[PDB]
Design a binder for these strands. Structure first.
Lengths: 342, 342
DNA sequence: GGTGTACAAGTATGAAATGTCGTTT
DNA sequence: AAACGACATTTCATACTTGTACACCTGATAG
DNA sequence: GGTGTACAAGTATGAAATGTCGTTT
DNA sequence: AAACGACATTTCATACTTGTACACCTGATAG
């Protein structure tokens, strides 16, 4: 009925503690469970190991084939090139693909996708960015000027922004498919300026309408009006407002370049290809990106009506937080020697 | 000092098979290991179970808490909408998100991202496809004409095709990042026509150049001329040519529409928004897509050279299979009611 | 910048499994 | 002694909870 | 259909574990 | 007898190998 290599050795422990002999136990063993029991020679050996003081009922580790390549030998490949295929590594290790699968899960390794990054910068752009951030930081060290900062940027809002569905289902079964987004589709073109205390002023352009040097100039003033009545502490300190914006063509034309001299603001330095230093981009629009995902607008009216609901829901401190992230981002901008950071 | 619930119960199997008494075994037990051993009452019990026949060393299933929901309750949720989040399913079951993660592993379930499908068809756009397939089948069934088929479309070839990187590394470590593709970067349009016996004629337009109804007209002759050299069997059968091409605007302007009548080619019916019935798309370009991935070009020259080598590498079997995938795709087209099929 | 999924550690369930101790064999 | 019979007291997977780690998402740019 | 990963069986490793003997406590 | 030394035989978790199964890619549209 009840033999078992593990159970048998347990019985040998029991006999040995009762102080019975090796051979005697082997007779009691055969008396209980019949002939199929082991030899006395093993009982003697097991007893031998008990006299040593080692009551482990499991085997010691058997012999095994030699490793065809070392763990640190694989890691050396990944050091030079983070991202290769299993079959690419397997090929370099004179081994099969699935062997490499195993070693990878055996080591601490997982597969995670790379980050997209805005642009392929040169040493040129990197030095500019680095220096700008170096400059903006040193000033913040002396005097914290973020309370004075007002920023804005412009962002397309598509009427239909479908996200790919991801469904929970039994293997081999098809998941829910979604229709692709046709680039040439209805899209308003939100323009928005804001500060640490909230959103100041925004214009949602009509389908297809955009921003030329004339339209922007007209916006800067429409802003300053709404800014005067929204921010009391401004009318006196009309020269103390710090303006942060993108280096677009309509953001440099004479007609506008002028309008900022007459408004008498301080245009903040903003390096080339630097969305990661642009509050509106990394914080405001980022947040929005989520809220917009798989959201569907039929008419401009609903878009403008959605914007308003959104902007309102947001607490003042959300925007505050976005602005007061500039310092830490500058600390990374510099630390990374001008490259993009996480 | 080697007691253990499993081991101890194993010892009572031994004493029992040595036809000793319950209170006997107990004494030997306390004699062997020490006072840290079960009471006689338990030995009396375990003996009872050895008389029924059962020698199960492990316990029977203990008391356990009641299931808050059921496995088919959750499956109902997935049957109506299979692509919810765990929190969303949890919410409906008055249970935590985590509690759902598990039950989903417990059941056979895995998460998988759905497929992109090129457009959102409406009933009219659907039935159009269904009908055009229905008809093309009914003809094929009668007589195979794919041998006469000669299709062709056009496709952009960016000079830089960057693809997101996938690295192997320890949890919480950065992966190899990639600089985004420049929408308005160098690209050459490729215009190519082919048939089951292989590529017939192609033109690689220069950076920025585009097909205008006049150009397409010219192209159709250059094709035709190139066609009768490469395909002998059309000198004789000069009206047998079947022509499958996209419903573009250049492909309908009268200047062209005449040219096709003067050449006297049977133009094949093609439904709108149906690149999944267009060999040039779903087969010939689909292949390139992989071959192009992570490939970089520097000059118009480099691309032209690569194309050739690629067209040569392709054995004639390839071109044949793409064309004769038609009847399959039609038959699925019509079966899915004009909807897209995977 | 926000969200989704799956690890890690705590609580409570509740039928085994177990100690007590006078009673029956 | 030897084993039961009721009645009390501890085990321990289990079906959840909460806390937390962390992939991967979101915004881009300039023209 | 193309490419990449991971599951499922199959196969030889090779030191332990076990057996078989003629020896010595 | 009861246990040891050699010397020959069987185990069994490994480290790999084919075959798969199967997730996700890749081509888009028309104005």
């Amino acid at each position: 009925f009840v033999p078992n290599k593990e159970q048998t050795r347990t019985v040998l422990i029991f006999c040995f503690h009762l102080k019975k002999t090796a051979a005697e136990s082997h007779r009691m063993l055969v008396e209980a469970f019949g002939e199929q029991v082991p030899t006395v020679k093993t009982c003697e050996r097991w007893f031998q190991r008990f006299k040593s003081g080692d009551f482990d009922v499991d085997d010691k580790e058997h012999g095994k084939p030699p490793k065809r390549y070392e763990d640190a030998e694989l890691q050396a490949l990944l050091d030079e090139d983070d991202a290769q295929t299993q079959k690419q590594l397997a090929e370099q290790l004179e081994v099969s693909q699935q062997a490499v699968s195993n070693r990878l899960r055996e080591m601490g390794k997982i597969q995670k996708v790379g980050r997209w990054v805005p642009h392929e910068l040169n040493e040129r752009q990197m030095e500019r960015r680095k220096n700008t951030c170096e400059i903006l930081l040193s000033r913040y060290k002396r005097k914290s000027f973020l309370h004075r900062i007002v920023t804005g940027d412009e962002k397309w809002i598509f009427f239909v922004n479908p996200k790919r569905k991801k469904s929970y289902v039994d293997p081999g079964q098809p998941a829910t498919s979604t229709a692709r987004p046709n680039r040439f589709g209805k899209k308003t073109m939100l323009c928005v300026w804001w500060d640490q205390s909230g959103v100041i002023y925004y214009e949602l352009l009509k389908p297809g309408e955009t921003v030329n040097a004339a339209r922007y100039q007209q916006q800067l003033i429409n802003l300053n009006r709404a800014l005067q009545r929204k921010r009391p502490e401004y009318q006196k300190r009309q020269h103390r407002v710090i303006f942060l914006h993108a280096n677009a063509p309509s953001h440099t034309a004479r007609a506008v370049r002028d309008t900022l001299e007459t408004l008498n603001w301080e245009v903040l330095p903003h390096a080339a290809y630097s969305p990661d230093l642009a509050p509106s981009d990394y914080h405001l629009f980022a947040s929005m990106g989520h809220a917009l995902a798989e959201q569907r607008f039929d008419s401009y009216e609903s878009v403008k009506k959605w914007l308003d609901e959104w902007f309102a829901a947001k607490d003042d401190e959300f925007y505050w937080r976005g602005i007061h992230k500039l310092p830490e981002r500058w600390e990374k901008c510099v630390a990374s020697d001008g490259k993009y950071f996480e």
